[PDB]
Nucleic acid binder design. Structure first.
Ligand code: NA
Lengths: 257, 256
DNA sequence: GCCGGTTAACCGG
DNA sequence: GCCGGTTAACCGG
């Protein structure tokens, strides 16, 4: 984690900072804390200037630093890693259509919010925003299915010391016409017990939890974390399939006749 | 539908409308073309003032004209219909603590953007907005499971002529730092072939379709539409119970 | 004290 | 045409 070292600095520049609210009034999903992410990234881009990238930004740099190679297959080789391609690359069509005149942009799908890279090591930072004027449910963190596939590809290629998936929670509350941050939390996904990750099937097969309450006591290796996750995943998928019937089938049998 | 009769007028007024790019960050989910919904509502209040209501606004006016009521239990009775209570009402604690000095505000999982009410008949209007400059996937229309519960409720309480769930799509495209409505469309859920609605399980069990493409040729009587929907839904759930093994399970067993 | 469903709307390594 | 995952973050008829 290239972030944990200067965490307090982050937490100190964020708490207290007021940012005028979005000219809409919703403050639901994407249209909420969003500007806090911008703040975090801006700080990092100035205090880790060379390690800090926006996912699409990293991709635009990757291809720009290799103008000699065109086509999608040659560009997919620029990742020198399957898992990394899975986690960060754009589609076949898009990858092939990229150019200095047609650069990549933000994409609702992008696995990460900001990218920190140094020494062929990658930190996938996803910043979560939370309105603490409510006591809502744990937000979507990452797709269980995506993580499952990511683990399977760590095992296949044997890439166990290449990337960390970390989370930064930014708590806020409305105050006048502004949103103001009241506190933050940090957590390393691969530092938590995988067998305990809660997967919310209906919620886009996403595992959900508040960064603030996530356990960080895992002791095995990254190879053992992945195995355990795939285990929990299959177990809970088998479980969901059976649980679905008891809730979405039987309760309505008395109508179909 | 109270909108359909005036639809040509709303399409006319919408096409050409512009709204400021909601935020510096790209427009996804709640941060997309939502502002246009405020324009639809505006037009409706302006031409159907006695019928046009925000969902929370309707609940606020309901409890408001019943000052003697008090208490969630007594207040739920005000709905005079179970199926409407299930689709519109708020939490028990939210209902209990309601007061003119503590009104309902919009909630994220409401159900409907706009409520057109008249003569005990309820039209639930949902506005879908879409970035037409690209070809994206059908958007989340409504929860398949929530629909099943409503159908189950309609059938049990035999209330088949109480409400309609309609949809308005308003397409836009980026013009500088403004979003401009370029097209529009409208369809009625209950006029569609229930057995053909696509249920996207992973995507919050949401049926998804582009409004402009929805089929409007159902024949039957609202009850058939419901019986036909529960049928399709259960079948899809069974199916989904299987497919979740061909994926998620069978292909990951190779690992421990 | 637990457990999970719903709004919004996105392309395809 | 058809099919279907993901990001965001929400409380409790
Ligand atoms: Na809407």
């Amino acid at each position: 984690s290239f972030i944990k070292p200067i965490y307090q600095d982050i937490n100190s520049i964020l708490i207290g900072q007021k940012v005028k609210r979005p000219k809409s009034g919703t403050l639901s999903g994407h249209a909420a804390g969003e500007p806090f992410e911008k703040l975090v990234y801006k700080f990092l881009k100035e205090n880790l200037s060379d390690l800090t990238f926006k996912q699409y930004e990293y991709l635009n740099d990757l291809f720009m630093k290799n103008p000699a190679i065109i086509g999608h297959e040659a560009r997919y080789k620029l990742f020198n890693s399957p898992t990394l391609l899975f986690l960060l690359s754009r589609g076949k069509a898009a990858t092939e259509n990229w150019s200095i005149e047609n650069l990549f942009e933000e994409k609702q799908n992008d696995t990460a919010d900001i990218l920190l890279v140094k020494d062929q090591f990658y930190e996938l930072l996803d910043v979560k925003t939370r309105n603490i004027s409510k006591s809502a449910q744990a937000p979507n963190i990452i797709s269980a299915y995506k993580l499952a596939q990511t683990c399977a590809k760590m095992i296949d290629n044997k890439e166990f010391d290449l990337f960390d998936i970390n989370y930064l929670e930014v708590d806020w509350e409305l105050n006048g016409e502004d949103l103001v941050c009241v506190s933050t939390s940090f957590a390393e996904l691969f530092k938590s017990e995988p067998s305990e990750l809660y997967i919310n099937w209906a919620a886009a097969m996403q595992i959900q939890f508040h960064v603030r309450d996530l356990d960080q006591g895992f002791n095995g290796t990254r190879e053992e974390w992945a195995k355990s996750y795939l285990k929990h995943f299959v177990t809970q998928a088998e479980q969901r399939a059976i649980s679905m019937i008891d809730k979405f089938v039987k309760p309505f049998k008395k109508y179909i006749l």
